[PDB]
Amino acid sequence: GVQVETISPGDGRTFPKRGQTCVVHYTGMLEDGKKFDSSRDRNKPFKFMLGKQEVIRGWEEGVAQMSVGQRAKLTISPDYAYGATGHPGIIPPHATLVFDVELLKLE
């Protein structure tokens, strides 16, 4: 469903836990088009919680699988992204998403 291609490993022992928030900064791109979902947010990156399903799976599964201080290039397939019905304009149907996420810290 989702793949995790690391570039800059992290410690390898601290990950997000159940009851924590993940503080991540990413750049979302598509196979070969453009950015649809980036995190070029002024002062605060993006922040979500594990076990509430606020972010698609590819992330939840992906980001989790990442450790505090690690950065990767994840590849999400429809099954884990926005199924078959996402939104016309941002996420066309069957549109594999590709994120470049950096788990920064937990809060």
Every domain of the chain and the residues it spans = 1-107
Q: Please identify which of the residues 15, 46, 80, 99 carries the catalytic annotation.
A: 99
Pairing, β 71-76 against β 21-30: unpaired
Q: Which residues contact 1 (CB under 8 A, 6 or more apart)?
A: 57, 58, 61, 76, 77, 79, 80
- Which residue is it, tokens 């989790």? 64
Rg (CA), the chain: 13
Would you say 36 and 71 are in contact if contact means Cβ atoms under 8 Å apart? Answer: no
Q: What is the largest CA-CA distance in the chain?
A: 40
**1-107 maps to CATH 3.10.50.40:** yes
Residue tagged active-site, from 15, 46, 56, 80: 56
Active site residue 46: no
The answer to whether 66 touches 4, Cβ cutoff 8 Å, is: yes
